[PDB]
Structures are given as structure tokens and as C-alpha cells.
RNA sequence: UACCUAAUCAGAAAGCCACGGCUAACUACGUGCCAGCAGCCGCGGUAAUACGUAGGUGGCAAGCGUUAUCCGGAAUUAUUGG
RNA sequence: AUGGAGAGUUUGAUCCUGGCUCAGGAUGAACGCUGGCGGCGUGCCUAAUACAUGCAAGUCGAGCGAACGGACUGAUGUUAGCGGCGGACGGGUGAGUAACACGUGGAUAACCUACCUAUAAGACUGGGAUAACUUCGGGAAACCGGAGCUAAUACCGGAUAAUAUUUUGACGCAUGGUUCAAAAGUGAAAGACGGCUGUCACUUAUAGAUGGAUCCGCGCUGCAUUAGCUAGUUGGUAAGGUAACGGCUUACCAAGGCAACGAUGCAUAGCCGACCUGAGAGGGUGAUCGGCCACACUGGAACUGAGACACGGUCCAGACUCCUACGGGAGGCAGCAGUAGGGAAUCUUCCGCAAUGGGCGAAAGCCUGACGGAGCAACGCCGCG
RNA sequence: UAAGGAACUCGGCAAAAUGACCCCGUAACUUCGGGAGAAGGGGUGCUCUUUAGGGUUAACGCCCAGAAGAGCCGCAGUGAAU
């Protein structure tokens, strides 16, 4: 095999994978922190929720998650708030 | 995207073409959307062409993009002209 | 648009919010031409399970509910 | 029967058992399995060449050959013509068609084919019995 | 320390999955063997197919043992299972691969095709 | 390369199967229930239009026969139609 | 009206019944004997067997940094690289699949959609790297790892922004719908031009078109000497996650659900338009062409991506085949030719992008074994000898 | 008790190995009872969270049992005996 386009596509795939997984890892940390603050009604619930909604919509713009998935996470967070 | 192109319908060294609106990914002689007209380039002298007007202007407004020679065929009927008039 | 409607008979009401509706129709034989009765069982949703076994009811299709149900109960007209 | 009896029990036609079964079966040496092929002809190896006595009404010494085909099937085949050059370990081409007298011979060896010569003195009917155009 | 009536695994693709021994070649009264020693044996479990089939009598070479071997420097190599490989009466294998590690002492016995067709010489 | 135009030559260009009845096409010779033929009915035992050959005939023809498989004929799964 | 032929054979002879056989039409045919030509077609049905060797997916230097290299400041190339798009199309095969796979008719108020089109609003402000390159090491290759620099329409942070989400008031069951008035938070680019602007890059909302997804009625093989099948099974309640409904998954409840109208099981099979045959009713078939589906050495998985769980992409396991300095590495013709093997049997390791279509590009152009043509074969139909 | 595991022997004599409880599975053959504990697999310690149950009751409290989680420790958790 090893068509020149294919050999390059491997390099740009891992490059995109490294950037992608870091971003959703940061998102999922924010989402978990946001909903755990809401559950015990901590004083920092509001900006953690805003931090989670910010990161969720930033990744949905990067096609990391689908747009419709962002709304389910967003709708879940603000409803519990 | 959506392309207005020609489909080969001829035998060996006697090609006949239909003017067909089809997707770009579809095979040349395969799946289509609508037939618009015909194109015979091997007729007596001038290549006889037949084109419909209502559907041809309907697909052009919908974003269909003619190929290089369908553009010529639509020009010889003034279709590209009337498409241009309605800015 | 319009979703299809069937009228059948309740043959099972042992599950909550779910009844089985027997819609019997007719299918002719391709070769001999005789009309043969055949029946089809439909599993329908009814949040307030007012249908009881033996009632002729009105059934209309909907989006998939559970693994098998695709119908809702529209109208109950019999008493039995 | 009545129409209702026909609806419940649709008419069942008889199956057709075909002659020359050994031409309808192939072999797969990789999977050690028998297949269905419907071959016009099959090629085999002569494991025995001899002569068979015919049915009671007739009387003539008829030449035959025990042939193991491309399949793992061992059949008996007739040898049309006058002279034949086949002994053991002879590759032959076998077609259909049985011999009425000979009981147990349901095939014919094609003359003028792979490792099977034609009839030496045949001059009319050379399509059958092999042999090329004299002069 | 391998003696007769000892069951060994076969480390090859000969067909034999596991075999047991009858004698240890090499001398009257010889009783035991270690890596690099040949034994007569009869397979007890064969693969469906394979060149060697169940119930045959075959020559074979020990390639790894649990008793293991001392090396001249005071180094010892031991293993977790007995094992053997069939031979073709020319110090050559019957199968085409060889599974598992092998001990370096087979180099000396001129079982070179056994040492060449091996995952790990040790 | 189609294709057209000039010369030239009947010259370089037919075979296959059948001929007992179904089923178009018959005689002679060789053999003598042998050799052989055959889809069925069956033929061959010193005068075979049934085998082999030769003439003739007939069917097709750059094809002609054989084999393999499907429908028909089969109203022989019958609904039409037992 | 456009369409329907029989004959032989059971007996000493006959009429019935009944089976067998023949005369017809066909084929991706093969074989035997022959063989002049042309035009249209067709040509591995078997081993989804294994593959030597060539080609079958690249393009954009007007996105941009080069040791760049170099006409003459350097046109032009891409040597090599980053980046964008394409590689999910086109081409092949029918192994698997008896299933909403396929055909037909519907539904989605349970759904996604890059490019293309149109309408609007825009495109503000900053930052840090890294390829390439230089220089050190390793290693037998394959390749790998250190330092020192450098760009971008590469990447990241703030600004602002919708019909995006949360809370507010004003139908066909789950409802749909567009006003309201608050809260959080979601962007972007430049390139090459002309006298600020044009073109084509962009971002956000809408619609349209296109392409997908799911559900349902009916239709769709044989066997009952295959009769009882299931236990997420069947329904509900929560939660999760999916583009989306849903036992799709998980907990907890209840015992449910299908079945002689053939559950289940076994065997076989890609389905259809269509093809052959028949007067018709029917019967058989699923080569070439077109639509759909599934598969890519066998088997799992995800990444990138609008779209793949991906034929000439990645990781792992397996079976093979090859290299190795023995530690480790490479491969996949069911793409086009072609080879070996199996078989009764099926072709050139050809020419060209001239046309049509496709990718990329502003275009010129480049690539295209798609395709257009040539080579071989009475394999078929037709026409002429 | 290394490695081997009936090669000892007239014979696996003796010795070794299984053993408790809980869950899941269990064939031929039958006189339909059985076979059967058949065979063949998995778990058992400790601490904490949680929270069903019924037993005496006036209630506290006393008994005897369940289920789901989260840990901890050893080579080994019916850690010995039976």
C-alpha cells in the first residue's frame, strides 16, 4: 500500500487526535465539576456551570461532539441548576 | 454537488447523450435525478440538441452547476441568457 | 400527512400501559383466488389502560415505543 | 379437490430426477466438500479397461472402462467405435448418455479427445467417433 | 531430568500436541536426559491433520526443561515446562515452525535448524 | 481506421449430420446375434434401406452434431384444466 | 380473434388407465469435425484459492516557510515539508445474509447532511509554538530520540453575534407554532487585483437542493420424520447515551412476549428491474446493463473526518509469505492486465485522456486501468460471400 | 522431599488427592422412583457505607436472617481440627 496521501494522513490524524482528546478531556472535567457543584449547592456553582457551557459549545464548534449532543449536556446542566 | 451533465447512450463510435441532472458522486451512466433533454453530436452537420426550459431553469435556480459542454448546449438555446436576466 | 389507523380487538391486557390488538383482515390467494382470513396482532400503548380483553378499539401508529409497540390507543367503543 | 382444500394444501408437483448424476457434482479439494456444478463433460482416469456382456436379448462383447472422474466418483463408461487405445491410467473425457444393454453404464467416453484417439477407418460420421478429415 | 514414562509438550507444528517417552538414547542403562538429548516417544494428542499422527513412534529432541541446565560459569537456565521437538533422523525438524523459547545448548548438538527456526535462543 | 475511387483475377473462400418408423432423404458391397448401432420401438444368426464402406439422396450451412441444464409437448398436481 | 398440431411403446387382437421416449425453443455453455469476411455484442459460472511483475488517487507556490534549486533581480519548478480539499467517489466481488436485506406503498410533531445555491449579519483584538532547515546521537533496515531557529487560510486566548440552551407569559397522544422578556455561553482569513473597491477564502444563522438514517402495511425458499420457543426475553418506572425513537444499555418492579395463520431449528440463497419458456394461466432463472444491499486474507476496535468504524488508511490478535547483524521489521489483485492452481470451460502483463464523467486548482493544466478505443476467442445475433 | 508420575507390583496394597457451606450446571440408561452430591465450573477473609426483613414489645432494647456498594490485607481467607 502506502500511497503518498495515505502516509501523510496518518501524521495529520494523530496530530488532530492529540489536539482533540485534550480538548474533550478539559470539557468533561468541567462538566463533571459543574454538575457535582450543583448537586451539593456550592457557592461556585454558577461560574463552573458557565465554564462548562463555554467548553461544551467550543467543542461542538470543533466537531468534537455533535451540536445536538451539546444541547443535551447544556439542557441537563441548567435544568438542575 | 448537483451537476447538469451528459450521459453516454451510444454504441461503438456512435455516441448519443441525454442532458441529465444528477449528483456528482453518481456514476456517469448510473443513478440520476431528472432528465432534461438530449444531445446528439453525430447528426447531419449541426449537432441536434433538445432541451427543456422549465426544469432546466428550475435546477439552475436550485444551485445545479452545468458542466463545460452542457453550458454550451444551454447557451445555444439562450437558457444561460435568460438565467442571467433574472438576477 | 397522515398516520395509518387500524381497528381491532383486544386479546391481551396483562401488561400495564400496553394492550395487544388483533386486527383481522383478508388476503386472497394468488393462484386460486379464494379470500383467506388472516390476522395480525398489534401491540399498542395506552397510558391509562382502560381497554379490557374483548374490546374493539381504534389504533393509530406512532414513533417506536419499547422494542415492539408502534401504536397508540385512540378510541374505545365497545364494553363487552 | 375443493378450493378450500387446495388453499390449505397447494398442489405439489413431482421432482425430476436427472440422469447422469456424476456430471452434476463438483469437488473442492481445499474444503474437502462436494459441490453442484452441472457440467457438460467431466474428465477422469481409467482405473480398469475391459469388456462387458450385454443384456439378454442382445449378444455382443462391449468394451467399457471404469473411470474415476474429477470428483471422487467412480463410474462406468462406454467406448464407442471399433478400436480404442485406452489402458489403465488413461485420462479420458466422459459425456452423458447410457447404454441400454449394459446394466451399470450410464456414460460415454468421448473419442477424439484428450488422450483418446478416434476411429481409424471412420469416413462418414467423423464428428462422432473422433478422427479428422481424410486428406 | 527426563526419564521414560514422562509426558512432554511438543514445541512445533508437527501435528503432535503432546507426547511421552520410552527410552533415552545414548547408552546402556542411560536413564535421564536434559536439553540437547534425543528420546524415542509416541504421540498422545495430535492436531486434526498434521504430518505426524496419533500413536506413531518417533525420534525427538528436548528443548526446554524444568530441571534446567548449569552453564560453565555458574549460570543456570531453568524453564516452567518440559518440551520437545520431533526430528527427521537428520537433526532436522518435522514441522515448519517451532513454538516457544529454546536453550542455547542446542547449538552444540548441531541442532541448528532447531536453533534457527526458534523464537528465542537462550 | 471507416468509406470512396482506378486496375486485376473466377481466380484465394464448405463443411457437418441424416436416409426403418416417429422423421425429409435408398441402393450395392463387406460382416454374419461377430464386429458393432441405438432416444424409444429395437437391428445384427451368409440376400441389414438399422452395423462399416461406396454412390445417390435430403436437412442445414460458416457452420453442423453430441453432451449438460430449463420450459413445452405433459390436461403427467388438472385455478384455467384430472 | 392474431392465439393452442402430435407420434412411438403394455396385447393373439381391442378399448381404457398409466408411465417412459421423441419431434420445438433457449444457454456466460463445453466437446468433436470443419471454418472466408464484416458490424454489434459477450467472454473464470469452478478455488471469497495463492499471487511474481507493471499501472489503478492525487492536487493546490494566487494558503507559506524553505538547505530551497534555479532563467535573468532572480520567470519557472517541489526537489522536500507544513496547511486545505480529495482519499467514504469512481472500480471489483457475491463470501455472508431468510432479514424491513430487497420490491412496492407510506410515516418521521423521534432524525443528520461537507461541497452547491440564495438571503442576511459579519469577519475585531492579541499570543505561544512547530514542521521544513541546522547539528548531535542511536539502530542492520524500518525508522527513532535529543538540542537551536522559522512561517502560515496551522494552533490558542479575549471582544461582539443569531431562530443556539435555561427560565418566562401569551393537536393526531408524545404535541407543534411564533411572539414575549430576562440569564449563561458559542466565530472568522487571508490570498492574488484595480484605483476605497472587484474576485474567491472565511464565520454565524436561516431556507432550498442533494445525499444519508429510522419506523411501519403488504409481498418475498424447502423441510412438521423441525413443535413449543425466549428470559433483555416482554411491558413499565428512572438514569445514561444516540444525529434520533427505542431494552439501545444499566438498576428496580411485574410475568410477561411469540407460536399449526408454522414460534424455533436445520438446509439453501444476495434481492429487484429483468431474462428463458408457454396460447394463456403458469414454470424456471437472477450472466452482461441499471437500482439497493453486503464484503475487501480471517477476526475485534476505534481515530481523522460532513460523511468510514474505511479495497490500494491506523492499532491488536490469528494463519500464511519475505528480510534480519536475532533485537526486530514488511505484505495483502473479490481495481486493470497478467502468473500458478482447480476445472470441460472463459482473453492483452496494449494506446490515450481526443470525447463523457470525477478529484484538485482562478485557470492553464495534473491525475483518472473510470471511460473512449485497440489485441484474442464462430461464444452469440445479424448481413455478405 | 528436587525432576518424572504406576515405569513398583500378582494387583495403584499402602500412601497420596476430593471433602464444609452457597450459587450455577448434570449425560447415557431406566422398572419413570431413580441415575445424582452424577460429571463440570465459580465464591467464601476483614473494615466501612447502605438498607431491607419476621421474633418476642408499650416502646427502648433483645434475638435470628437478607441485598447492593465502597474499600483493606496476606503466599494462602470453610487460612487450624472435623
Curated annotation (Swiss-Prot), chain A:
InterPro entries (UniProt xref): Ribosomal_bS20 (IPR002583), Ribosomal_bS20_sf (IPR036510)
Molecular function in Gene Ontology: small ribosomal subunit rRNA binding; structural constituent of ribosome
UniProt GO cellular component terms: cytosol; small ribosomal subunit
Gene Ontology BP annotations: translation
Tree of life domain: Bacteria
Keywords recorded for this protein, A-Z: Ribonucleoprotein, Ribosomal protein, RNA-binding, rRNA-binding
Pfam families according to UniProt: Ribosomal_S20p (PF01649)
Family in the record: Belongs to the bacterial ribosomal protein bS20 family.
UniProt function note: Binds directly to 16S ribosomal RNA.
Annotated PANTHER family: 30S RIBOSOMAL PROTEIN S20, SMALL RIBOSOMAL SUBUNIT PROTEIN BS20C
Protein name as catalogued: Small ribosomal subunit protein bS20
Organism (species): Staphylococcus aureus (strain MW2)
UniProtKB/Swiss-Prot annotation, chain B:
InterPro entries: Ribosomal_bS16, Ribosomal_bS16_dom_sf
A Gene Ontology biological process term: translation
Annotated keywords: Ribonucleoprotein, Ribosomal protein
A GO molecular-function annotation: structural constituent of ribosome
GO cellular component terms, A-Z: cytoplasm; small ribosomal subunit
Disulfides per UniProt: none
SUPFAM superfamilies: Ribosomal protein S16
UniProt record similarity statement: Belongs to the bacterial ribosomal protein bS16 family.
Name assigned to this protein: Small ribosomal subunit protein bS16
Taxonomic source organism: Staphylococcus aureus (strain MW2)
Chain's gene name: rpsP
UniProtKB/Swiss-Prot annotation, chain C:
Membrane spanning residue stretches: none
Molecular function, one GO term: structural constituent of ribosome
InterPro entries (UniProt xref): NA-bd_OB-fold, Ribosomal_uS17, Ribosomal_uS17_bact/chlr, Ribosomal_uS17_CS
Keyword Ribonucleoprotein tagged: yes
One cellular component term from this protein's GO annotations in UniProt: cytosolic small ribosomal subunit
Record's keyword terms, sorted: Ribonucleoprotein, Ribosomal protein, RNA-binding, rRNA-binding
Ribonucleoprotein among keywords: yes
GO BP of this protein: translation
Function: One of the primary rRNA binding proteins, it binds specifically to the 5'-end of 16S ribosomal RNA.
Assembly notes: Part of the 30S ribosomal subunit.
Family membership noted in the UniProt record: Belongs to the universal ribosomal protein uS17 family.
Designated name of the protein: Small ribosomal subunit protein uS17
Species, as recorded: Staphylococcus aureus (strain MW2)
Swiss-Prot record, chain E:
GO molecular function, a single term: structural constituent of ribosome
GO biological process: translation
SUPFAM superfamilies: Ribosomal protein L14 (SSF50193)
Entries under InterPro entries matching the protein: Ribosomal_uL14 (IPR000218), Ribosomal_uL14_bac-type (IPR005745), Ribosomal_uL14_CS (IPR019972), Ribosomal_uL14_sf (IPR036853)
Recorded GO CC terms: cytosolic large ribosomal subunit
Keywords: Ribonucleoprotein, Ribosomal protein, RNA-binding, rRNA-binding
Alphabetical list of CDD domains matching this protein: Ribosomal_uL14
Keyword 4Fe-4S: no
Quaternary structure (record): Part of the 50S ribosomal subunit. Forms a cluster with proteins L3 and L19. In the 70S ribosome, L14 and L19 interact and together make contacts with the 16S rRNA in bridges B5 and B8.
Protein task: Binds to 23S rRNA. Forms part of two intersubunit bridges in the 70S ribosome.
PANTHER family: 50S/60S RIBOSOMAL PROTEIN L14/L23 (PTHR11761), LARGE RIBOSOMAL SUBUNIT PROTEIN UL14M (PTHR11761:SF3)
Family the entry assigns: Belongs to the universal ribosomal protein uL14 family.
Protein name: Large ribosomal subunit protein uL14
